[PDB]
Symmetry: D2
Subunit: 301 residues, 4 copies
């Protein structure tokens, strides 16, 4: 046998950081969950009981906290790039660092209509994430995402004109509920190293905000022909607004809300135009995915 692939590290590292402005009194908090997995000349730890090549996962954990103490933790694209760069530079034999960060929401409270200097609310389980792959000799590959953004619209969703054959029972509809949990990812141009990442720092928060704004407005305003059609519109708009993105990926469950025929009980009318009470379905669910990039077709368009 031989090792074809290997990576190892510390997962589920919870990290909080506070910033205190001593002049104003305003405090700002950041909370995340971090995973760092390393690759390199480590195969003998597996094949030969050679622990000399292992940077202990406990040490990786220590390193995450030390790096958070010595550097900004925001934007997460930057923090992940710093962290990943550290491992490949510090250790000659480590040649890739794979850093995943999940950022948790701590939104400043408004009390009596004024932002409070040191109190926060988890206003959504929506996350902001990064995946930062730092590969020695091949720069820094970053995928940014938002996830867990749960939305519903009560009309202006349709689904008709789909293929009908002997496996089909679904009724066409011109007016349904649409609900999903948005997972949207934007993949950056490869960066050559930490300097190039730093050179684009403002773009990270700005692009996250654009992606979220586009998602919400397109969901709310598109009289939707399908999940497929709506999600494509989101992606094409995000690409148009940030040239340093190469692709946008959406992964969207179709969280079905079924009508309930109550006509068996006193002729109650609760379907079609009279549908008011619905049964949310926990499972199963449609799952619709696509990755959108910029076009390069010049003929047969």
């Amino acid at each position: 046998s031989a090792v074809k692939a290997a990576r190892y590290g510390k997962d589920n590292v919870r990290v909080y950081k506070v910033h205190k402005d001593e002049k104003t009194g305003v405090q700002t908090v950041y909370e995340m969950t971090v995973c760092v997995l390393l690759e390199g000349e480590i195969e003998t730890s597996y094949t030969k009981a050679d622990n000399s090549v292992i940077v202990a996962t406990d040490s990786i954990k220590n390193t995450i906290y030390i790096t958070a103490k010595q550097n900004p933790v925001t934007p997460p694209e930057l923090f992940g790039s710093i962290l990943g760069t550290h491992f490949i530079e510090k250790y000659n034999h480590i040649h890739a660092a794979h850093v995943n960060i999940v950022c948790h929401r701590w939104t400043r409270m408004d009390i009596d209509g004024k932002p409070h200097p040191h109190s926060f609310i988890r206003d959504s389980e929506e996350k902001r994430n990064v995946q930062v792959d730092v590969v020695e000799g091949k720069g820094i590959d970053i995928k940014s995402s938002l996830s867990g953004l749960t939305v519903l619209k009560s009309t202006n969703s349709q689904f008709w004109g789909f293929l009908r054959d002997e496996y089909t029972t679904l009724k066409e509809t011109w007016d349904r509920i649409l609900s999903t949990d948005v997972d949207a990812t934007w993949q950056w141009k490869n960066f050559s190293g930490l300097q190039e990442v730093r050179s684009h720092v403002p773009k990270f928060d700005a692009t996250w905000a654009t992606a979220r704004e586009v998602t919400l407005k397109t969901f709310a305003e598109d009289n939707s022909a399908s999940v497929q059609a709506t999600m494509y519109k989101m992606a094409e708009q995000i690409l148009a607004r940030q040239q340093l993105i190469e692709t946008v990926e959406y992964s969207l469950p179709n969280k079905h809300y079924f009508e309930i025929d109550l006509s068996w009980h006193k002729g109650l009318q609760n379907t079609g135009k009279n549908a008011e009470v619905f049964a949310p379905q926990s499972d199963p669910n449609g799952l619709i995915k696509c990755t959108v990039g910029r076009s390069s077709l010049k003929s047969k368009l």
Copy 2:
């Protein structure tokens, strides 16, 4: 043997309802999870295989949807009271109905600074709940609550002066993080029946809003001596603001954030005044409870 207690019914009934204003176009959505458990002269279903006394749980489910079609689902205190009253009135042999409702958030989206007529966001996993116990001959007992309201303050929390003995390692502190998931319950005066519940309908939304406002403002503004002291202040204020409440209960985890001594690494200072990076602890957690009512002591106060 004999049956000392019995109740049965349908749990985990997911319910959506929409309201459509055909004049304005504005739609409003409600989503909940409902449980109804019945008591009564049902013991022979257990002892004698006598199914004649069983209102099938499937029928209970149907009844939940029919009741939602025929009645408002808001405030949940009202809906639960209607639902529970139905079972004890419809079925001579059923003498109590226990209705639990968890209300899920669907907050209207603002798009380009304007409220959207039919698009919504799950802006928090915080819930609004009721427990409505309709007991034939003894009226309607309602407990209302908010739960899953997750908050953090980064300073203005203290914990010193606690008992110290041979089991104690904890350091006193004059400046710590405080974070919790708020579960707050207000218990109403017994209502004689559905008419009395209906007579107080506006008070339900108003008292929920008061409880939430008091919780947030007291958490944010109290320079806290302990979880115990802070939560008591919340409860006493809610009681002062609604005379139809008899008691207020809080159940609060103390979600610990530990300092990380980094002085072993290059003399880094990350404790006390220089603490910036902390380790959120998933477990264990303090758990602090109290039920507060109005005083009746006239001496030794």
Copy 3:
């Protein structure tokens, strides 16, 4: 205002203990999650910022580990009684200790047909639990339980003869699937203190084993008229086999498996006698409860 009820302590305390037989080499492991909440003369911690009355939850945590080091952790009824007794004896002003223990399975592996001396498998998420309430001047109240015991039978379950009215759609059946997650609790006679608990120690493991055996055999062998009828049979048998139990409680979800009519597709027959493929329903679910004790009726039986 005044404090009507209060309790506080440490929840979610994970504990492992190993026993090593140095003669034989056999090691045995125990893992649990512990909660201890205290009551007593603590109201001024809430009303007056008086922390002097607080045994810190951090100290409660330390105490759990020290007690596990100094005492057996099995049976959990005993460990909980020791732990709870400690708090009311050590602290004059603490008058009740409420100890909840969840015991996790670590079953010894058999390797090549021989029990291994120090390797274990989590063979089920089923738990064995206790609730031990140590109340000064009123002894020790113990409720023992098994939970998370998930079972299914594919036939020999029926449900017919239930009430039928204008809310009823359910078809009677003489042959269905029955599946549940068993939560079964046996409530012991009050014990006067720790000596009386110790005097009955062998009965704890023996009664847990009886309850589990009765549950499984009655589920498997009863041609069930209903969940209600089957669960009552379980309870009556457990009571007959341990006179120091006062009551047995079951709480059983009815985890529905629906037939799927496929006759619309090529006349496929998948209902009634030809039902082979079913749709497990995640929600909603029936929920059936009862508490059974010994009879005291002497007339009208």
Copy 4:
């Protein structure tokens, strides 16, 4: 813009099937959760609101149940291959089907030492899974796995000789607890189509059993130098026992159990040789991965 990748289908489809031997009375149950995602000439559903190319996810769901009615559901490698083949053959424009199956345990109960004909227990949350990718013109790629197999050994695990630098605090150890949740995957040689899959059917259950046996015996018997070294031994043995496997992947968390120094309390000794009570750590956790294949090095070995 243009669609660079797309797939869509139905996720979280719960499926039960029973087999009834009418001669013997013995019934056998199977339960799974199925996901099917399709690829093909579907881009216009995203770009042009062209629903004609969509096989509705509701129809995919129907198809899963019809296929389970008409075919064996075991081994899951076979069922997934049948299912996936159906979509690419039935629909000219669909060119790949990606079928994921999670198989749930329903182990036959033994009652009074005899296997019961129709009663089952969920004896573990361990799963048996498949990922079957049916790609038109490129055969059938199958990855089989076991997951959720949670184990612990109380000694015969070590971790010393790892890299030590200014980021390292971890103490070397010659005797520790090792616990993990095993996720093990074996990747089959590409199959040309359904006939070739069928030709190897007995190998699927046999290889799953081998992988599980090797995992448990190697975990129990290896005096482990590291997670890395132990997991490599597992993989190399599985490869040696099934030549139709190309690679074996393990993904193993290191679920840490920390010693608790109690020497501050009455000089209690609970570390090193006297360690009995430990604190299981929920997070963070090491995470150790490798993919092992057969060697092709002929020099510098």
